[PDB]
Design a protein around this ligand. Structure first.
Ligand code: BUE
Ligand code: FPP
Lengths: 204, 204
């Protein structure tokens, strides 16, 4: 931890660039995702160390499942293992997404109710088979009964992979979020990417 | 000097003309005196969009929240939005104004434009968010029927004044929008800020 005057209460993480990162190392597109797991657990350890209270990760969307079977199997395998591995740490875990779909991994149904593991030092949410449209229409006030209601306002959204967009992430929680874009692919996560985001957040 | 030849152009551009106050404060003027310097920047962006063939542009006017600003700022920013709409109506715009008309803070002069109106040769659709609120927009539905339903998906959002936030502009229409932040304040608008945004959009 550098010393901070202020931290965001709730950080959202879009872990993008897994496929470009793979392709670049000479692998098949879908082999990138498994290299996204250790960076996830590293971001989480730092959040805990510096005192970030809540983190939401963009797992995958309904649209993402459109992609070829072999990519889908892989980024689903990586989400399961990611939630599995976060469960061995001190995390309050919540998975949000459309469970009324063959595309929601059965192995993650267990974490659709927020669950404390160890001391529960940081709330982790996970968007798995998430759709913005599914989310808003879930209600049909209604804004308090959206599918993503258990996930509060996002102060800071950090997106790896160089693209500046939400890709349909939590349009209610993101209406006022600061947005920091790291050009490096997610699997190239370094602590300094988080410290740079938090340095931007507080100097705002 | 020369107008860049783009491989690919967004069909719908969003503008967040921020920095009017900081701009004035930097010049030693009063906070409120910046807004009047916002109209030529906007008409010039309009004429470039007509030349390059951008079919649609939405401007973020003021939010419901913004009306609680010191009276002298609100008068200035209301008056700029009214000027901006009257002026464009003299230059071949199809104008649509979206905002909470059921409010004393909805400027009466813009009730003429709450249904989309072709003026002259209708060279580009221009939209204006006035007395607008994301919460008001979405709960209007009590999602084809949100207040802002006649404003389509945004391809590219360009914000002046270096803040990296959506500031509640059109949550639904901005879910997949590429976002480009110009650091300079809106009154310092340069054509090259638009070409920089377009070079960015093209490159995705
Ligand atoms: C289409 C044309 C011609 C131009 C429209 C752009 C204009 C005229 C801008 C000024 C009016 C406007 C939309 C104001 C928004 C309302 C508020 C409260 C804005 C906050 O002020 P700011 O963000 O400009 O100032 P700041 O960022 O604090 O320095
Ligand atoms: C939760 C966690 C930390 C896990 C990391 C991996 C993961 C499951 C996230 C990405 C899922 C996905 C469908 C992204 C596709 O783009 P891309 O980013 O893979 O590839 P591209 O940007 O190179 O096209």
């Amino acid at each position: 931890t550098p010393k901070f005057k202020r931290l965001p209460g709730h950080i959202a993480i879009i872990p993008d660039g897994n496929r470009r990162w793979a392709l670049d190392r000479g692998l098949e597109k879908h082999e990138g995702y498994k290299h996204g797991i250790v960076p996830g657990l590293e971001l989480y350890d730092i959040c805990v160390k510096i005192g970030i209270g809540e983190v939401t990760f963009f797992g995958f969307t309904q649209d993402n499942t459109k992609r070829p079977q072999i990519q889908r199997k892989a980024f689903v395998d990586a989400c399961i293992k990611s939630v599995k591995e976060l469960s061995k740490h001190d995390a309050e875990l919540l998975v949000v997404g459309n469970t009324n779909s063959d595309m929601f991994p059965k192995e993650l149904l267990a974490y659709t109710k927020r669950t404390k593991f160890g001391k529960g030092k940081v709330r982790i949410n996970f968007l798995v088979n998430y759709g913005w449209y599914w989310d808003l229409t879930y209600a049909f006030k209604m804004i308090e009964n959206i599918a993503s209601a258990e996930i509060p306002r996002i102060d800071l959204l950090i997106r790896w992979g160089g693209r500046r967009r939400l890709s349909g992430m939590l349009p209610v929680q993101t209406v006022y979020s600061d947005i920091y874009v790291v050009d490096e692919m997610w699997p190239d996560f370094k602590p300094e990417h988080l410290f740079n985001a938090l340095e931007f957040y507080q100097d705002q």
